[PDB]
């Protein structure tokens, strides 16, 4: 049930450790630039993140070991506005035993995996999933 801890660099070179996000809900995505689901769902995530960032939900979109350039090109094409990290050796992918691409893990403020999602997600499902993990209620 507990999300394995990991440390990866984001696309700006910043160290991101999962446990440094305790107290927040984490929408943890594993994805590749070629994935039909990701091309569709990344824009929905980016629109939802505009609302949920200020409700204590963080997104960590773990790319499965593709190049910096391929990742950058995808992020620009799909308007990504949330943290993307590079699982350069697929170590984290292996720790989470991820099969289909993509896979999403809903992690609560305590670091517990509350749902694993491999199906297609509408923007509404993404909204409800972020609600499922946000730390209580935050005032406007």
From Swiss-Prot:
It is a single-pass type II membrane protein. Residues 1-135 form the Thioredoxin domain. Coiled coil: none annotated. Disulfide bonds join 35-38. One of its GO terms (cellular component) is plasma membrane. It comes from the Bacteria. It is found in: Cell membrane. One of its GO terms (molecular function) is antioxidant activity. Keywords: Cell membrane, Cytochrome c-type biogenesis, Disulfide bond, Membrane, Oxidoreductase, Redox-active center, Signal-anchor, Transmembrane, Transmembrane helix. One of its GO terms (biological process) is cytochrome complex assembly. Belongs to the thioredoxin family. ResA subfamily. This is Thiol-disulfide oxidoreductase ResA. The lineage of its organism: Bacteria, Bacillati, Bacillota, Bacilli, Bacillales. The gene is resA. The chain holds residues 40 to 179 of 179 of the full protein.
